[PDB]
Amino acid sequence: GLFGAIAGFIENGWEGMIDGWYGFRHQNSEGTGQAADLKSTQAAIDQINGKLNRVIEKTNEKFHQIEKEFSEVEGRIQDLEKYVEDTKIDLWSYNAELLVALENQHTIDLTDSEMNKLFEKTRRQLRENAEDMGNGCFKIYHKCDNACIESIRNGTYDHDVYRDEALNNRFQ
Amino acid sequence: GLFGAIAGFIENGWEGMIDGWYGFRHQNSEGTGQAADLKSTQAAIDQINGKLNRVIEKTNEKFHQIEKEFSEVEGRIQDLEKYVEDTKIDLWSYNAELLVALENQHTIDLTDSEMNKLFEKTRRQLRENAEDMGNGCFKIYHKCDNACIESIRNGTYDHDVYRDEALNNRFQ
């Protein structure tokens, strides 16, 4: 949550969203509609799908090792074997703990960043025609029908042809 | 300093700030005032308060180990014991170095992000009534008395009722 989008200014998730991870809910004269953003969801999923194969490539293959369970008490050599195994176990347990903590932190920051990136991309499409209400939801200042909305979601929103009407609505 | 808030566009800390970590300094007709933001300070402190218990949970308990100091010279077994201990020491020293470096980097990025998040939250409260002067300080474009300022700090700033006066002051 480094960017304050998720659990920040969005303030709420959408349990009704099953199409993807990030998406839009629009409301205009025609009526409320909902869609999912495939590009951001795919980017986040792609960055998450591995994330453990990129550090621990795979399981290495160990065949013959030392004895790790002993019946009698020998002394020096058994002490050394027990010490070596305990040291290895402690070091690998620490590696696991730290790796999982780092990966979880980065995953959370990554998804937050994807949400923020989608918000900023949308805000940059609506140059002057819309105002950010602050709850993660844009107020667009002109007649924007479903074709308009799907152009916003598409990334081909033509801001120039609504600029005059939007500016007149905003600043009166 | 990934967001450029601290040591970035804020450019200066406040040694006179002792109430919290992040806060506001306002100046209006009545006079200059200063306050601290409790929510951001508490969030940063909460994220920092642990940060070492979450990786190294605690100290594990070791009772009987190998000998690590030797009087005479035996040969193979003493060499192996010395090698095992030196290997463990080097690996744990590297773990300590890397862990501290990573935690420090993340702490710095975290506090920078909290500063940026406070700035963005404030900017989103003042939708069109204020302009970011760029030095981390907002110019509000209307009569904003101490009740107005404490509403900004509160998070209940009502932007709608100053919109006309502010817009008239900005764009003439």
Place this chain on the structure above:
Amino acid sequence: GLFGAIAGFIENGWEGMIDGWYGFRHQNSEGTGQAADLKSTQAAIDQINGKLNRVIEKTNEKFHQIEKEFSEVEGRIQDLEKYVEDTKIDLWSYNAELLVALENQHTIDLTDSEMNKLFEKTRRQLRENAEDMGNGCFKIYHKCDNACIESIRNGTYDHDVYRDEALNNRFQ
């Protein structure tokens, strides 16, 4: 790529840029010009120049160790020596893999953040005189000659004296 500047809203690198890492391309009445930003490039280079001396300070100095290659087959002691060496090798290989992955991720995020920081600094210089076109390129709304542009790049852009003309050009 946590901020979406590089490979995000900039969308393209400049192979013609050899002066520095980050820079500006301006176009006005006089003609197209290009320059590099020394401050951001120097900051990124400074943060990258070390980045491996700060964790692995140097090479430690090892003189007499155990035997790691054996001719005959002894049994317990040779098994223990082989196990100790294999454990050390596996642990250090994991350390190398994780360290390189973390450093690469942070370097990419760092350079992306420097690009975003330069963009935001420039945007804050042009308070109301310019509009972000969204492709990482600003449309300035007034006569801005080469002295104007080099003032923008300098960081001493005087926004107040173009505010009226720019606002008139924007909102008509």
Place this chain on the structure above:
Amino acid sequence: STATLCLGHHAVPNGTLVKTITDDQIEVTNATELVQSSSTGKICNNPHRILDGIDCTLIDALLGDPHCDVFQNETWDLFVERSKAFSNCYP
């Protein structure tokens, strides 16, 4: 006619130099030490059953050296073996 609202963060006169991924030395407001590098010089006798072996090694107390007679039937969590211990029985 207009108000002003600055944002800022607290600083301190003197700061502590820490080390990050991208800085050998970077100054912060506060920092805690993570390596315990000093000792009080004395062994606390709780919660561990310490057994100070005065002039007796563990093996000498085991065999039953005369000057180790006080160590018969002793138990310990940590046997502390002093450098001054010596043997005074059959070699």
Place this chain on the structure above:
Amino acid sequence: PIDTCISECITPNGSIPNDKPFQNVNKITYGACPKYVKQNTLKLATGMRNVPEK
């Protein structure tokens, strides 16, 4: 020398507090001890970047 006091970690140099996660006293330890590291100091930041006035 032995002392009348409470401590969970004993080194040949005496008892040490185990509140810190690492120690540089001795590699020979007994009890709930910190881990032995070669560094004599490791500072963990518990505050923000310090940018003072002027």
